[model samples]
Target: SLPDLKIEKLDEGVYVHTSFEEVNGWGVVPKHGLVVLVNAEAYLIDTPFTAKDTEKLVTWFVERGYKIKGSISSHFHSDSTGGIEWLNSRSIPTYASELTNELLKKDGKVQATNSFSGVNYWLVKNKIEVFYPGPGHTPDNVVVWLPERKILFGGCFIKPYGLGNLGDANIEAWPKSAKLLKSKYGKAKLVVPSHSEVGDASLLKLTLEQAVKGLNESK
Candidate 1:
């Protein structure tokens, strides 16, 4: 059966939703992206779970007369990235931080490659651009900033529901990364978290606060 690839409008142009049905061990997993209408070019933020799901997502965009000019992988995780190959197959470029690019270059221990395969290298062909700010959840994690609207396509690095767990996370650099993100995008009004609902930039503060509190209590 085909996945429900619906275009849910959360804001002006940022559509939020999961790519595939909740199954496998990824039931809680959420893959996200937004369609940005910029200068007649369409861009998708994160590719999401799998090629099949990405195809469904792409099709949804195509129906709206928007060709996905580019896509950015939210992070190195497969739950957010497993669809690079589908984009590659369609000649759509994918963007990500340098570390994410590197992680996809080689097989990672995080089970990302087991599902998405080694297609991240294909980013070279479509003129994908990756912007890195500083260290965070992963040293190379980067958040996407839209200059036109001042909206950020902040992948899994930041969340709205709460500060995320530090499993496979860069605990030491997390605070610095949060501060950097806030300072950089502080002027912005909206942010699209890679895997959750959309909200204000202050969500970054809450996420960091939660992580810090948990660390202190646990230690």
Candidate 2:
């Protein structure tokens, strides 16, 4: 059998895929990503942490008649882009921020097929906004904003409240970046984080608080 993948519908055309990965210190934990449907086409926001798991994810979507249009990584982490090779083998276009591409390359990892700076609207509709809200969790982490749906995919930039010991985070910039992201997408009704449960904009504020607290405690 394939990996134990769980898919949950978030809204009319939005869904979240839950998978597990063995993190260095966290052991095996569930990781969540988005499967956004735009005009019947499926765009993956991150894949499972391995090619095998990603294949299962693709097969599941394909069996459902959802055409795999493309994918975008929230950052360069394996939890975000681990299935990039599998996606490329299937001829699926994958995208990431220019900085993410560079970081992946430097780490001797596979880079995204397409890389761009600032914002991008990958769908036929302009409502999907891929935003690089400075650096926090990583130097190139990005967040996805669905203005029409009022949904924000905060990726690893914004962590779950009470979560500690930010892995590879830029502590000095964490609070400011988190605050800027809050200001930019403050109206988001549903906020989906890379790990942990989903919540509303209140989670965003909580993430900001945690970032500040983490930095203060660090100092």
Candidate 3:
């Protein structure tokens, strides 16, 4: 049980928190989450890998004097919403797409406290927005965008991996989703992948190319 986690500040109010765990033959794997701070409010894009790690993450923010108001998961996957149950316990609000919440229920996982639908959902007025570009890594996956920072929190949708863990992947829809992301986020200055290694807009291009190639290869 490594149970390792850490947080690094990206900008004034932006952070990328990464949690680590080791599995047999997989060695150590890292999962990235996002944190957005505005005034006394601390918003989380996704939770750590487990409830226990999330508790520690919450305490870190609280100790540093934060309200920890908004919590949004990019999808229904545990890597994204694993802390929903704990956040709910703390009376904090958690949000996810309507599709994501539905999938959560189907998976017998804790659903988000709030849900939205449509092509775009704003998390913080025009500053932060969540967009569902069809489906990719999972049927309910979405990407978070920050216009001001030009940041795109891609979750597991657009990653630096090679069709990773396709057990639930929408292989046919993934390429379309990847292209959708590129067109919509053309102005994105930074691309944050689920597993860390934040990069520039080219990350989207890379992902799109890979997705297209993967789709072709599947034939």
Candidate 4:
């Protein structure tokens, strides 16, 4: 009894998985995650919107013959976590920023198994670079970059949201994070956002404009 989950091949060893779910009876919302396959191992960024959905997703990947290497949460939101508890139960190593874990703990959500600070090279072979520019979508939101593919998984950070959930947002700091993210990953050929489809680095510019505009309007 799960909603349709769509998967798209972005590039070699790259897949974008999307899941639609009703959030708090607020209608259906689509959440996206990135799967990077290195050798025979697959790494998940973010996750499906629910544990069961995540279980299905993981199964799909495993059935395709990729061992689950790990999963990383870009923030402390359920949209980012989705099945973090399930992942932990599977003994799959999970990662998040210290700030992310703190907020997750504060909210009584399961904390990621490992915590990183600033930038981290979680997976060897230097394929993934998880960077926390600052607070944008959430206080501890991080953007994941696949340097080899020039793909930046912006998670909810790069989504152009005027108003979604600003409860833990840092409006004033978002613009800075946006600019820093673009400046650092301007070479990203595919910029993927959790709330939208994948695009080029221009998505970062669009997100930058939205962040600045939101900041200006807030004043």
By TM-score, the best candidate is: 3
Q: Model 4 over residues 186-206: C-alpha lDDT tens digits? A: 998989998877889899999
lDDT of each: 0.63, 0.84, 0.87, 0.86
TM-score of 1: 0.77
Which of the predicted structures, 3 or 4, would earn the higher TM-score when compared with the native?
3
**How well is each residue in 44-117 modelled by candidate 1, as lDDT tens digits?**
76766777777877777788787777776657767667777777767776655555767777664222222222
- For model 3, residues 83-159, the per-residue Cα lDDT tens digits are 99999999999999999999999989999899999989888897789999987889989999988888989998876
Model 2 Cα shift for residue 161 (angstroms): 2.0
Better of 1 and 2 by TM-score: 2
Better of 1 and 3 by lDDT: 3
lDDT of 2 by residue, 1-219 (tens): 324888889997899998887666787777899888887688898887889778888888889989999888998989899999889888999888888999999999988899888655444357677887787888888999887799999888878565443667788898888888899888889999988789998888998888888888977
- The Cα error of candidate 3 at residue 211, in Å, is 0.8
Question: Where does model 2 exceed 4 Å of error?
Answer: 1-3, 119-125, 163-165
Clashing residue pairs for model 1 = 163-207
Better of 2 and 4 by TM-score: 4
Q: Model 3: how far is 58 from its true place, Å?
A: 1.1
